[PDB]
């Protein structure tokens, strides 16, 4: 159908949008804290602690299968790095305080895209 090739359009809009947003999200990561997955050879009790781990690559992989059907989708891995990190490491540690920085800069990106969803539509 026509339109199922439209919502397509709609969905890989989407992702384009999206690609845009984890590009500069990741930008806000310049010492790469968040690009793959906590190491379970390194921190082998690490699922004992976080139940739903999330990192950079991770995210892309999804977005990639257009994976993300609506930017909340998109923004609940966001804050599961997030989340995470300041969960597992103490306030005064160099990875909680890169998390906190994170946060605090995506939010700006993440507020303008919200906008861009809801007005492109």
């Known amino acids: 159908s026509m339109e ?5 359009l709609r969905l890989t809009e989407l992702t384009r949008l999206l690609r845009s947003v984890l590009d500069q ?4 990561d310049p010492a790469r804290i968040f690009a793959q997955p906590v190491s379970l ?7 004992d602690h976080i139940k739903h781990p999330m ?3 991770t995210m892309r992989k999804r ?3 257009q994976g993300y059907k ?6 609940e891995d966001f804050d599961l790095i997030i989340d995470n990190c ?3 490491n103490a306030r005064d ?14 939010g700006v990106v993440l507020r303008q895209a919200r906008r861009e969803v809801d007005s492109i539509g």
């Open 41 to 47: 050879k390194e921190v082998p009790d690490y699922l």
């Open 93 to 106: 540690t160099v990875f909680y305080r890169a998390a906190v920085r994170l946060r605090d800069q995506g």
């Open 70 to 75: 609506n930017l909340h989708e998109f923004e």
């Open 4 to 8: 199922q090739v439209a919502m397509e």
């Open 86 to 88: 300041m969960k597992y």
């Open 63 to 65: 977005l990639e299968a």
């Open 55 to 57: 990192d950079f690559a």
């Open 25 to 28: 999200l990741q930008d806000k």
